[PDB]
Amino acid sequence: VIKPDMKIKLRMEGAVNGHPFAIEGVGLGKPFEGKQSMDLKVKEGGPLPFAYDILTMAFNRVFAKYPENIVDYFKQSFPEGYSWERSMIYEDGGICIATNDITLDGDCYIYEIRFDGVNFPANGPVMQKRTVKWEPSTEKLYVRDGVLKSDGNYALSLEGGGHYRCDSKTTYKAKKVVQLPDYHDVVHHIEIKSHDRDYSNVNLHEHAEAHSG
């Protein structure tokens, strides 16, 4: 029963270059408008010694407006839910892998997120916190064998100009028998709308809309 208003509760446990951390968040979203928003708080490992922007895409494609002509794999996956696994290879050797197990408690999504990154150069934009925002991204979704997957070429804008590229690959796994969709795109807009000085508190907004190839 995906309702027009849904709640979000999440915990992320992770480490970057071996430094552990934990983040908890609460939020709300509009599945049918493709809109979501959440408040995120650092519980362990603060102040984070890395750019927060590498975590935001880990903090649910149900919050994407799907037209009637495209199969909605994500709204179709509940109340059992689904999970995904993701790799993110940055242009300077930095690599992140993350997972999210999404379940349902009434009208509230529950995220169990794991996030790990290594090989970020000490002088790079991530360890030095020189990232600004994610550019608008186009996610390419497709089904290979019997598995829904997605690819992405994302770009982080840097302070002082330039961009920091990231190659992303995601695997989705439904916990029930759902209709697999046909290839299509999802355009994403993600933005930190507010944060305190050390990002121990963050307000994150996301907007997603599915389009055809």
Residue numbers in the entry: 6 to 64, 68 to 221
Task: Quote the study on this structure.
Reversibly switchable fluorescent proteins (rsFPs) are essential tools in super-resolution imaging. The much smaller family of rsFPs exemplified by Padron are referred to as the positive switching rsFPs. Jakobs and co-workers demonstrated that only two mutations around the chromophore in Dronpa led to Padron, the prototype of a group of rsFPs in which the resting nonemissive off-state is the trans anionic form of the chromophore (trans−) which absorbs in the visible. In this work we apply ultrafast time resolved infrared (TRIR) along with TA and time resolved fluorescence (TRF) to characterise in detail the photodynamics in all three chromophore states (cis−, cisH, trans−) of the positive switching rsFP Kohinoor.
The structure of Kohinoor had not been reported. The chromophore structures are similar but not identical and there are also subtle differences in the wider structure. Comparing the two structures, the F176S mutation in Kohinoor reshapes the region around the chromophore. The loss of the bulky aromatic group apparently increases solvent accessibility and relaxes the steric bulk that contributes to the positioning of the neighboring Y162. The resulting shift in Y162 allows S145 to adopt a more favorable interaction with the chromophore, with a reduced hydrogen bond distance of 2.7 Å in Kohinoor, compared to 3.0 Å in Padron0.9, and a more favorable bond angle. The more open local environment also allows for additional conformational flexibility of the chromophore which can therefore adopt a slightly different conformation compared to Padron0.9 most notably in the methylene bridge region. Changes in that region are known to modify excited state dynamics in other FPs and in the bare chromophore. For example, the F176S mutation and the shifts in Y162 and S145 will change the protein environment around the phenolic OH, potentially suppressing ESPT in Kohinoor. Significantly, the cisH form of Kohinoor, which drives on- to off-state switching, was shown to behave very differently to the structurally and spectroscopically very similar Padron0.9, in that no ESPT reaction was observed in Kohinoor. This was assigned to small structural differences between Kohinoor and Padron which modify the environment of the phenolic group of the chromophore and to the different electrostatic environment and chromophore structure in the two proteins.
